[PDB]
């Protein structure tokens, strides 16, 4: 109070020294059950894959994708992502998600990347230069090699494939001047070969299953978003909370108000969130702003003593010598008395505090005045037999200081 009054001596009175707000603890977040999940399982654990010339594309839509299952798995040889962070898209959404799966061999996995050339990159599967997505591959010798699957790849093509183009035509490739008649011959070759996936092949010659996730993020609606962590709730404790994207700080409590089956969160008046239903358990809670109020000291004046009695306004002080609850707040450091005296320092709610003897600050319900019942009767009169003349002082302000402010010299100078 000496600080906020800019003095080393403060007079007898009650001064609002500061404000006090209970700080929130253990913030909580909640989001509805993850009932619908994205079909990455039927893409990655598909019993049969597809030849690289006829690569399979799976469109991912209207689902929540938990990409952590992909990068937390320890059964991948390569997980190269371009222009996107797989560890950072579990709180991200995409306007479009594609999943391309096929089978190649070891030394050809390096071709599934932007700006590559070769049999696979030019005639089977081409990625764009500005590719945004991940290239995931793993050895599949235990599945695609026996001593009965038949995987194919394209040998020739009259022009290189555009990015994400797919050619499945089995027409005879014309390499020379003479035109083939849909039949193989001189300067005429069938465009597809089979892979020679033998279990005893070298590592670079064994089959590798490849999945290519590609993403798009335009200023357009999105339907593929990852999962959202959720935690348990609390009661009667000022907490920062996140309910279905709505952030707020308060004490959550049980509420008798019933929502309607469609209403999520409610506002009593003045566009202030007052109730909210949790998405998991489908239960309504009332939000109350956790206790806050001005803290004001009561001091009898410095020269009298240095004692003070703190008053935390409108705070039921179950929380931070003798702690006395009053209808104007909580009083810390002031003894409560039963008798009543004339009001000295106005606390509020019909309660005043004063410094009196040993030498303590006492709070009491102020006395309106002395009580007397003047003796009325239908035939009794009280006549004055004497008098006192009395001079009293009435003080009245009549004027102020005639201040004049030069606008320009004050503003600019």
């Amino acid at each position: 109070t000496k600080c906020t009054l800019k003095s080393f001596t403060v007079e007898k009175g009650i001064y609002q020294t500061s404000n006090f707000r209970v700080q929130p603890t253990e913030s909580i977040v909640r989001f509805p059950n993850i009932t619908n999940l994205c079909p990455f399982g039927e893409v990655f654990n598909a019993t049969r894959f597809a030849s690289v010339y006829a690569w399979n594309r799976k469109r991912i839509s209207n689902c929540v994708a938990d990409y952590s299952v992909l990068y937390n798995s320890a059964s991948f040889s390569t997980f190269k992502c371009y222009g996107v962070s797989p560890t950072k898209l579990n709180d991200l959404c995409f306007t479009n998600v594609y999943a391309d799966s096929f089978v190649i061999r070891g030394d050809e996995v390096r071709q599934i990347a932007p700006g590559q050339t070769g049999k696979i990159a030019d005639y089977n599967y081409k990625l764009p230069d500005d590719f945004t997505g991940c290239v995931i591959a793993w050895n599949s010798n235990n599945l695609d090699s026996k001593v009965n699957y038949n995987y194919l790849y394209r040998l020739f093509r009259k022009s290189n494939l555009k990015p994400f183009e797919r050619d499945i035509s089995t027409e005879i490739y014309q390499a020379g001047s003479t035109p083939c008649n849909g039949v193989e011959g001189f300067n005429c070759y069938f465009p597809l070969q089979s892979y020679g996936f033998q279990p005893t092949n070298g590592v670079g010659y064994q089959p590798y299953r490849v999945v290519v996730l590609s993403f798009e993020l335009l200023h357009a609606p999105a339907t593929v978003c990852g999962p959202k962590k959720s935690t348990n709730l609390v009661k009667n404790k000022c907490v920062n909370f996140n309910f279905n994207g709505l952030t707020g700080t308060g004490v959550l409590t049980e509420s008798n108000k019933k929502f309607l089956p469609f209403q999520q969160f409610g506002r009593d008046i003045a566009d202030t969130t007052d109730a909210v239903r949790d998405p998991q358990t489908l239960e309504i809670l009332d939000i109350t702003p956790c206790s806050f109020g001005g803290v004001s000291v009561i001091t009898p004046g410095t020269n009298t003593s240095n004692q003070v009695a703190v008053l935390y306004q409108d705070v039921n002080c179950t929380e931070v010598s003798n702690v006395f609850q009053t209808r104007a707040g909580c009083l810390i450091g002031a003894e409560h008395v039963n008798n009543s005296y004339e009001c000295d320092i106005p606390i509020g709610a019909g309660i005043c505090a004063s410094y009196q003897t040993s030498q303590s600050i006492i709070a009491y319900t102020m006395s309106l005045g002395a009580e007397n019942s003047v003796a009325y009767s239908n035939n009794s009169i009280a006549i004055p037999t004497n008098f006192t003349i009395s001079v009293t002082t009435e003080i009245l302000p009549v004027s102020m200081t005639k201040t004049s402010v030069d606008c320009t010299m004050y503003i600019c100078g």
Binding site: N62, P221, A222, K257, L260, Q263, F265, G266, R267, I269
Partner: protein
């Protein structure tokens, strides 16, 4: 064969809940006392549309929404069926599938906002036939699909009223429960103004 749209034809604007308070909402609504075109075919979709139908034998089936409906561009094809209601972006009536959804007076409100299709429905114990009595009801049981096209056709496959929503503010009174007991139309009348 027009017929004035009465008070009926108002829906819950958003998900929020309001108890015993009056609110003002600014979005598409069906005007009070606006002569809807009772049909007894072909219907446009300039904007969101209030569709209200009465069938003793439930003859009417789902709505075939379409921007062009020439098989060139994707349709919406709401249909309904004893077991379930099926809606696909792609039976007897026909004309690159993007999305399919299957789930479970007769007020119906359909609108497309920023590519999101919204449906509002209500069931009423009608006692007078061939007139929709002025009364109040609304709900928001909906299915949202991000089409992003401007539908222009209905082709509903035994008479149905059809009215067109307009962007005019309303004042909705809210019950203690949170339901919309009543509403008034701001620009309808100077008294309502």
């Amino acid at each position: 064969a027009y017929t004035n749209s009465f008070t009926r034809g108002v829906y819950y604007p958003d998900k929020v809940f309001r108890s015993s308070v009056l609110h003002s909402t600014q979005d598409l609504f069906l005007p009070f006392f606006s002569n809807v075109t009772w049909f007894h075919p072909v219907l446009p979709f300039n904007d969101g549309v209030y569709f209200a139908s009465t069938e003793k034998s439930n003859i009417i089936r789902g709505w075939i929404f379409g921007t062009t409906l020439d098989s060139k561009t994707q349709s919406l094809l709401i249909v309904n069926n004893a077991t379930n209601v099926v809606i696909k972006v792609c039976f007897r009536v026909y004309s690159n599938c993007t999305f399919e959804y299957v789930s479970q007076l007769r007020e119906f409100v359909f609108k497309n906002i920023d590519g999101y299709f919204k449906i509002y429905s209500k069931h009423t114990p009608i006692n007078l036939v061939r007139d929709l009595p002025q009364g109040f009801s609304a709900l928001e049981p909906l299915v949202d699909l991000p089409i992003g096209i401007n539908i222009t056709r209905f082709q509903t496959l035994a008479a149905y009223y059809v009215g067109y929503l307009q962007p005019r503010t309303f004042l909705l009174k809210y019950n203690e429960n949170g339901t919309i007991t009543d509403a008034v139309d701001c620009a309808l009348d100077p008294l309502s103004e």
